[PDB]
């Protein structure tokens, strides 16, 4: 048989880079999870992979702001994926 690393095939989607805050709109949900779900629902039927989708989440969340503090939020995926990750609808 073949052997791959013990820690292969992980995807860790973080709402924010280390040391910083992430944001929750109490009437809507969090910037990160709401963006993630929107992108998944839109792009998974198109056959787009999760890294393309998380790139879009980085884009969308990067354009939001906390006008109280002039604050921003930067999500940050990390991965040991060895193949494209798609979630087909059929």
């Amino acid at each position: 048989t073949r052997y791959i690393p013990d820690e292969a095939d992980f995807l860790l989607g973080m709402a924010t880079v280390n040391n910083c805050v992430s944001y929750r709109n109490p009437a809507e949900g969090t910037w990160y999870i709401q963006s993630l779900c929107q992108s998944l629902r839109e792009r998974c039927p198109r056959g787009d992979d999760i890294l393309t989708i998380l790139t879009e989440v980085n884009y969308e969340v990067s354009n939001k702001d906390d006008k109280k503090n002039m604050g921003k939020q930067m999500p940050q995926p990390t991965f040991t994926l060895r193949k494209k990750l798609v979630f087909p609808s059929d």
Binding site: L11, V17, G29, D65, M70
Partner: protein, 152 residues
């Protein structure tokens, strides 16, 4: 391009740990005296449920978990037989700080202590299959500053 097999129904379990009520944290942990309940978090839990059910995952929600409860839940899935699944997803909605998430009791769980439960040696029936963790939490108390750029 190589692509992960993604054809089982369900695709796999999608855990949702949904922490709203931090009364115990406010009560028991001095520095978390004024940590707030996460009003609106149910809107994320619902969005994830709709989204991943639509993508053929079996949703396993758990509301208001202490750190020990979080570890109990993950142990259950670490020891479960995922042979008939193609994927595993775990979503954590909570407060957090550098490298950790908080239980509703204000105890800390290092993120890599959570993910490491599902390595190939610890969960062989997920070997070679994608394991996806979405962590919605602060990772510290600093505000991320903005920088000016041209509009796309």
């Amino acid at each position: 391009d190589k692509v992960y097999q993604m054809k089982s129904k369900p695709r796999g379990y999608c855990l949702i740990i949904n922490n709203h009520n931090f009364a115990k944290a406010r009560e028991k942990v001095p520095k978390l005296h004024s940590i707030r309940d996460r009003n609106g978090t149910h809107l994320d839990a619902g969005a994830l449920t709709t989204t991943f059910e639509e993508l053929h995952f079996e949703i396993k929600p758990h509301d208001d978990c202490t750190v020990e409860q979080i570890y109990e839940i993950l142990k259950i899935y670490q020891l479960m037989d995922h042979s008939n699944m193609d994927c595993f997803i775990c979503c954590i909605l909570s407060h957090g700080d550098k490298g950790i998430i908080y239980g509703t009791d204000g105890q800390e769980a290092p993120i890599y202590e959570l993910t490491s439960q599902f390595t190939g040696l610890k969960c062989p029936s997920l070997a070679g299959k994608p394991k996806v963790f979405f962590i919605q939490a602060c990772q510290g108390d600093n505000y991320q500053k903005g920088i000016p750029v041209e509009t796309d």
